[PDB]
Design a binder for this molecule. Structure first.
Ligand SMILES: COc1cc2c3c(ccc2cc1OS(N)(=O)=O)[C@@H]1CC[C@H](OS(N)(=O)=O)[C@@]1(C)C=C3
Ligand SMILES: [Zn+2]
Length: 257
């Protein structure tokens, strides 16, 4: 089964998922001098005041917080998007050292981690249908740098002991994802893919320019999770990021100058 190890990592994924070598794979390096400012792009509209978090889960490749997506409660609109996209989950990618961990890079700069807020287009009725469409998902990507602590992340950090190994989950209610956003919503956007199998080419990526800062003690606790299930040889969950893929026929747009 796929993973991030030497014998099952990203360089192997194309054997089971041949779309790994496709034309709109993610992540990419964002070349800030080649991205084009597009005045047609609109501000993002993030409406998370009514979000209902449900559960937090170690899925063996990351940890994720899931939300109730049965109604328009936490939605993303505007920017490059047509229509309304509902928040389903968020999860992170991070490194073994502070100089790596993000999936997207900016002028080849890697950040310590990257937060993905995954949303699906309500036109398609359920997330399984949306993954089959070129405009089915919108993922908001936020970089993490190491510095001052982020108070709104601490509730996540404190529960990670209870989901240390693959398949563990816990109730995780009343978590407000607004505490994870930077002050600015300036963004880059391009058409891309999921960065894990099945690598489907269904994602409008919206990558925020401004990182959030987290403390070294906060990111340390990510690195103590396990890829393995309980009672198996311990392997720390680190470096669960896919390296940058070829941009090919694509243009990255910026909402700012
Ligand atoms: C990082 O992993 C991501 C996985 C995503 C998935 C899905 C949607 C978004 C995902 C986003 C993921 O994050 S990431 N790194 O590209 O932003 C699936 C849609 C239907 C599918 O279910 S099925 N029956 O094929 O087992 C889902 C729920 C499975 C994975
Ligand atoms: Zn992700």
């Amino acid at each position: 089964h796929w993973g991030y190890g030497k014998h099952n990592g990203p360089e192997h994924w194309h054997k089971d998922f041949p779309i790994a070598k496709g034309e709109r794979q993610s992540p990419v390096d964002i070349d800030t001098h080649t991205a084009k400012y597009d005045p047609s792009l609109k501000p993002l509209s993030v409406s998370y005041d009514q979000a209902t978090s449900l559960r937090i889960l170690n899925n063996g490749h990351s940890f994720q917080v899931t939300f109730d997506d049965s109604q328009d409660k936490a939605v993303l609109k505007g920017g490059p998007l047509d229509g309304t996209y509902r928040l389903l989950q968020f999860h992170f990618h991070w490194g073994s050292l502070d100089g790596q961990g993000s999936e997207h890079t900016v002028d080849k700069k890697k950040y310590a981690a990257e937060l993905h807020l995954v949303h699906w287009n309500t036109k398609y009725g359920d997330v399984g249908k949306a993954v089959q469409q070129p405009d089915g998902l919108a993922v908001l990507g936020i970089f993490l740098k190491v510095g001052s602590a982020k108070p709104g992340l601490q509730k996540v950090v404190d529960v990670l002991d209870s989901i240390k190994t693959e398949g563990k989950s816990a109730d995780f209610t009343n978590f407000d994802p607004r505490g994870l956003l930077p002050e600015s919503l300036d963004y880059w956007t391009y058409p891309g893919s999921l960065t894990t199998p099945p690598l489907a080419e269904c994602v409008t990526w919206i990558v925020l320019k401004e990182p959030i800062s987290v403390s070294s003690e906060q990111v340390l606790k990510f690195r103590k999770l396990n890829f393995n299930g309980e009672g198996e040889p311990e392997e720390l969950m680190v470096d669960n990021w896919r390296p940058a893929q070829p941009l090919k026929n694509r243009q990255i747009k910026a909402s700012f100058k």
